[PDB]
Write a protein that binds this ligand. Sequence first.
Ligand SMILES: [Mn+2]
Ligand SMILES: [Mn+2]
Ligand SMILES: [Mn+2]
Ligand SMILES: [Mn+2]
Ligand SMILES: [Mn+2]
Ligand SMILES: [Mn+2]
Ligand SMILES: [Mn+2]
Ligand SMILES: [Mn+2]
Ligand SMILES: [Mn+2]
Ligand SMILES: [Mn+2]
Lengths: 377, 377, 377, 377, 377
Amino acid sequence: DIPQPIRGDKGATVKIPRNIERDRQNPDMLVPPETDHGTVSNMKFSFSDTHNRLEKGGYAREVTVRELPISENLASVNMRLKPGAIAELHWHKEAEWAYMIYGSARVTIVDEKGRSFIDDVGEGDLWYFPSGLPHSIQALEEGAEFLLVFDDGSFSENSTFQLTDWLAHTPKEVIAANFGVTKEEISNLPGKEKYIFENQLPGSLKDDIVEGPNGEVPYPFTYRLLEQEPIESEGGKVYIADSTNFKVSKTIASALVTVEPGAMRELHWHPNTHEWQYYISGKARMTVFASDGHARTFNYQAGDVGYVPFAMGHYVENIGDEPLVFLEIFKDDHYADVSLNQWLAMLPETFVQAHLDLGKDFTDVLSKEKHPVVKKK
Amino acid sequence: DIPQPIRGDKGATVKIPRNIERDRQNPDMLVPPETDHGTVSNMKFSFSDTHNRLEKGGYAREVTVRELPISENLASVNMRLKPGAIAELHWHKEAEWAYMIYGSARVTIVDEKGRSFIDDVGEGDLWYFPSGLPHSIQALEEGAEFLLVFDDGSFSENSTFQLTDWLAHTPKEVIAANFGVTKEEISNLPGKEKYIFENQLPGSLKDDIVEGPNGEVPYPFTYRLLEQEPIESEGGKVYIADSTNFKVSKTIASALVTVEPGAMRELHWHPNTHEWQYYISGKARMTVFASDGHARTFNYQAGDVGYVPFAMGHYVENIGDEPLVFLEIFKDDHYADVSLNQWLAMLPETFVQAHLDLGKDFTDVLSKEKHPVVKKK
Amino acid sequence: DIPQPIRGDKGATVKIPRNIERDRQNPDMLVPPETDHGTVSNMKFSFSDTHNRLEKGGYAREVTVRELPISENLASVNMRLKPGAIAELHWHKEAEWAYMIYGSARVTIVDEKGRSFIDDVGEGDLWYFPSGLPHSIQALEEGAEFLLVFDDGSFSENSTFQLTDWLAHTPKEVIAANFGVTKEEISNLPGKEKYIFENQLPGSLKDDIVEGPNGEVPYPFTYRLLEQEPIESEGGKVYIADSTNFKVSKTIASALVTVEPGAMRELHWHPNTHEWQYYISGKARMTVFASDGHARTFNYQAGDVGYVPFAMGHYVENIGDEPLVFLEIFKDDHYADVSLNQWLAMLPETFVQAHLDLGKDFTDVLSKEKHPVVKKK
Amino acid sequence: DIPQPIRGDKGATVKIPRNIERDRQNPDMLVPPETDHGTVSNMKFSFSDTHNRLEKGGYAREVTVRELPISENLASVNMRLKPGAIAELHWHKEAEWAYMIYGSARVTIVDEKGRSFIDDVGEGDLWYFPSGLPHSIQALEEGAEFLLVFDDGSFSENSTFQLTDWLAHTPKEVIAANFGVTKEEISNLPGKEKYIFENQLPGSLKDDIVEGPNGEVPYPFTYRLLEQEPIESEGGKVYIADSTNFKVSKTIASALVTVEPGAMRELHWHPNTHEWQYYISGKARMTVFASDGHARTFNYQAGDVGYVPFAMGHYVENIGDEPLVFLEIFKDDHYADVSLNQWLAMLPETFVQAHLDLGKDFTDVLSKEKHPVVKKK
Amino acid sequence: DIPQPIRGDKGATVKIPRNIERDRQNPDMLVPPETDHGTVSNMKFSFSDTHNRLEKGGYAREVTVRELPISENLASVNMRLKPGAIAELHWHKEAEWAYMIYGSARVTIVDEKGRSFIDDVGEGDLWYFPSGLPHSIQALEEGAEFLLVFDDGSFSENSTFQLTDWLAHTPKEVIAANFGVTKEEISNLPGKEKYIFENQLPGSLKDDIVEGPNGEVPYPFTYRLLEQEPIESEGGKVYIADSTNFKVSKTIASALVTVEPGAMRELHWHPNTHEWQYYISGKARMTVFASDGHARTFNYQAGDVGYVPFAMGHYVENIGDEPLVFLEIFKDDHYADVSLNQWLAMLPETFVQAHLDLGKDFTDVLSKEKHPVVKKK
Ligand SMILES: [Mn+2]
Ligand SMILES: [Mn+2]
Ligand SMILES: [Mn+2]
Ligand SMILES: [Mn+2]
Ligand SMILES: [Mn+2]
Ligand SMILES: [Mn+2]
Ligand SMILES: [Mn+2]
Ligand SMILES: [Mn+2]
Ligand SMILES: [Mn+2]
Ligand SMILES: [Mn+2]
């Protein structure tokens, strides 16, 4: 049918030309809970509503502070590579964090002591490249599509330095002097950046490993998130990766969350920092509790970025038949949450009762174990 | 079918879960012109992607700097009233400008000399309420749905002062003293705001006109935009309303633009200030030329807000079968544009030729008359 | 007695060491109306709580953004001169506005065309010196104590340029060259500023008038506020001085307000800009209505600066036996207010009734004439 | 008598209506040392000059950047609870630090691992609640009045999240799903926040301790400041509590200072960060030395907040007959000071003499041991 | 010889490697007047110390806020064109003001009503192009070198929109539709900007004038500054051009100043706004008096930009044998100054004497006529 912003005796039919397909995706925005109140900033933006930069060998589109202004500390890139295609050797002002959603890829990175790291990354794997360290991505046989997160919301063209772009704007005589070659031996250098470019598939990973006088890097730059044992509860799983287990990831803590049909990520908040969200599949709604009687509900599905400012109360409820899969991202050295249930469960029962105007029949259902995802009884 | 971000040999199929209905609405974002280049801020946001505040008698949803951060100087409200329903007497820090898209309404406003203005507004009419002057809107027999524009992008709950809210937070003894009544005579005052509320239809407009010791207001607060003679050209019309014809509208200049199927709003820019857009019906694309090799194309349809920062080059092309109807809004005392065609038409032909690397065959097609909307030959 | 923050069954006795004399001055702050709600910035500061700069011949103390941070656009100086004492010839980045509260003084000012203005100012007179134009103040036989207002809240030592300070930090050879004199003829120039200094009383004003080749100034720099006919109403008078009557005062509009015992400055707001207040004598309370259910009541007496941010609702009620005398100051070319009474009086009565949930018995007491000050019936 | 701003031959009698009781409290502001010079921001504000929020069971008033703009990093709340009364379970964006000035209270706090801490706090005890961790305060038999300090000067209503407010703006169906209950079992939930509310006295502390599967917290959230051995010197004591002894207090370092009649907190500065002051009882003056010939003297008594910007020179002298008791507060993991005496005492004597233009008769009185508080010889 | 920073018994020889040629150009910076005191921002920058952008047909180098951070409101370009060479048709966010120092040029500009202006400009002529209006410059037979001033200090690549750059980043199909041509008829359009490009000399100015349906522009865009009668005084001339005589120049007021050897621009200040300076030839020193005992002397010669913040006291003294020629630039609709001499000359003589501690022998030399430039008696 045709949705209308009516809730009981409130609201009215839309009477001007309108976007029906969007209203359908936003049932809880066109028809908000009656508990929503006050000005709350937009916490929702679709990658689908951004310009897609297409190159020979793939593409990349971004969600930044310029699209989603609440997220000042974090931005993201959706990047795709065809098989063998290269994200040209480069470096960033920001640290880079990544989730491999589709395919596989080979990454290189050399650190500030000349030590190198070359590894293959598959679906559910992460990498984290500390700011300023140069790296690359090349897709294997299947290609690769992955989500990148940068720890500055301002990420732009000015955040990225490209190998060939550097050389293109360096005097030919300097380059020649820097390397001990003639200017002729380097006249074939590219005139502009490459960015993404087609290439033959690499060979085996062991034939690529470069030996060096400086040692192996002390900590790997990749992590196998789905090979960990997840916090498994009633209606889903949660895999955490922060600087306590994925050592190099000092500025990005993360959790992959799976919410079964009829389940929810429980009511909680984060006592450490802002949450940045990516919705990989499924459909959700979330209400952000913004303090002082302010609360706003947003709708989410695949391709959406979401956001919860520091310490605001929230939940994320699956409102579809598929499983709901999303990322929670935090610019911090650690994951942390406080569970509404567990909090209240560890207080004297009559104290909780005096607060809530409810009886023993409520407090008996509180649990002292944190269940991040719960199935509807 | 199923769109893919491919243009010739560039781009690739999307491989992760995605928003197909959005990709379909954004053909030129998923598959951008090859002429687009560089970082350009988001200039596009749908009212459909905002929380709708539903009340008994209507609703109101907003697009502000918190949704669309490029637009710092201007925000907007989509407001709907059921028949007889009242937008409670109130005032703003911002000036308010409005387009009646559907229905009709009665407005009141009293100015700083105690003079009052009560008028009815119909489809295609505007009003403009200078900052701080109190006003109201009540819908007539058909109801009313209209677009409001406020001349600060920061518009929020803190921009609006409500009659009953004031009285609710004023000591009862003060109110009584202020009016010369007992506290009992006013115990029935509402405890909270009304905002929007159901009410009986007003009677005739002449029975509402209040006579006063202070005179009629020197300039009306409403304007009949569609009763003007429009600049009519090949593929559409343009009705302008700025402070030169709609006198009270010192901070908002505006034009209603109609672009027939197969036509476009020509390549132009605005030498005075930023453009803010509302897409009433139809489907468009626009490329914003951002200087220094930066350009980004956006897609638009009914319910979308658009934006062109000061002096950036643009056009707006109808890409559908319906007519394209949009508003151009400027926070200024005047409308102004420079036409790429007319500009070049008023320069020596060989000068233009030396610039463009083209011949007499091009310059012969330039016109010295400004045609804001052109049909594709 | 000893005040306590108790209102009915709310609040409690203070139990820690406390400032009793302050609590006594703040009855409505220690015990706020029950209608006050939410965070509202401090709108109250006493000159008594500022460092007094004492010089031979007088003193000067200031209230600025650094004391009262809400007032970003306006600051003030309380300045005192003993008889004959001079506020050393100087100039400011800010425009200067002044109320002579006590005594009399002679002012000089020379404008950008070399034209001079020398006049005497008495109690209730004003002056306004446009930014950057040099001026002086010298107290007559009685001395002089007056309030200065500068149209930047940031006013500081860096706002003021002093005649002798300039010459003290200009090379002696330059000064000599500038004037056509020897360095010896100027060795007696002061080594530091004077700021305020003792001096003999001037003679008659006519013997001081300097004739020049450039004409009289087109508009006087002083104004006799109390010689105007005031808007006189039931419980007080109001004398306005803005750029419409006091021509040179382009950036400062002002009103002297007198509220008799048992009267109030009515419920109103200002649709143009922020209000800055100085309480000359008497005792007041005011509630600032800050929108969205925010309101805070402040207490005022002689020596206090007050403030009402743009468009916020307020009233000012005399809560003492003496008359209440205060200044309302606006950084604008004009005074403007909207009266709650007059506003509602110029709307259809049943409309007002539908808003307020009250009957004909209320609307009959509304008046279409603006009475800025009302006596309690 | 009646104070006047006269110092020798400087200054003059006040001639306009004035605040005598304030002038009396500010002897060194109305009549500043002759050594004071230049623009120095206000470093003084009384809680008495703030709006007191009264609730059933107590009250709370605040001093923030909006009252005292120099203190951007720190704000404070004066909070009072009647016996048994509860500061409703809540959490903050800021870390919270507290001094129990009067009475006693029970606090709860649950940390990010589900571990709980319930303890009683008495006069001279502190607590520190890290940002985002939920907590409560309930007053015991005597009630409780205490000073809270938050490590952001911007503290406002938007800093606090309340248990019942969250639930009031969360969809009833979500809450029910989150807990595994029917909507009926929770229809009695409060509709608005509680904030502070009357309640029966708790029982014994041991009967409240909640056991849990997660362990005891690794570090207590309270500290017995007055049970420490203080740095005792001639004219007073100083008890320090920073993150080196009160482990959890990472963002707040503090010292309780006692200055006997005729003594002073010596001339010193802080090489680490800004100082924030609360004057619990007694009367002081302090001169802040602001560099480059800038210095301003302020007066303090019970209820005043004071402030010394990073590294500025100061002393705090008791100017009354009672003992002077104040708090020094630093947003840092450690307390640190540099003593003018000890500094000079550890330099070669002739070096110090060459600097000060004084002899062996001065340097002989320097001491190498830091005496924070000295009695006037 | 070899300069040293010694003044009497102050300073010392430089002992580290140093820039001798710079020290020689800065006698009053290496050896400042003894009257200079305190922190004053840099007010001096040489175009010689900026990167020169060289193109086929000329060059252009800039001084902006990024070079000279005090000048936030104004920036400048030094631009050179070889004979016949074109500054490609373009437009700016900023208004543009220009002084033709060498050669001659033809300018075009079309305004917002389609009206065109084509004129030739010679040495000492100005033009002013209002923001956003498109224009061009082409050098005549002699070439042309001129100073451009833009009324935003932030001027950068993002301030300029270029004709060919626009078309290069506009879809070919849009351009074709916009003009009514095939895509083939426009395949020769340039792929990148031109910026500056070689070209044949134009013919006569009358053969270039384009007639149009819209009328002549109401006010010319050029001005013959040196054909005016200058304010001629003892040691030099001053030609003013502001919006009172050069009508279109609403945002830029200007004066060309000539100071003979042994003369100076007198001690004065500007009561309206900041001064921006360009030193065309000669050598100067200036002391900026910054208030509150702050003053700093700077040295200037050909190619230097100088700056005096609003209302600061200054003079500009020729310290060389050639005449000194500089521009004074103000972002305002009018030129205005206050003369130290004339100011004091229009005050009662004994008043001036009481201020300065000097006698009739001084005041007798004051003049009531403003002489902007004075020769050393
Ligand atoms: Mn990267
Ligand atoms: Mn979360
Ligand atoms: Mn409105
Ligand atoms: Mn446009
Ligand atoms: Mn002054
Ligand atoms: Mn007012
Ligand atoms: Mn708390
Ligand atoms: Mn200290
Ligand atoms: Mn230009
Ligand atoms: Mn000047």
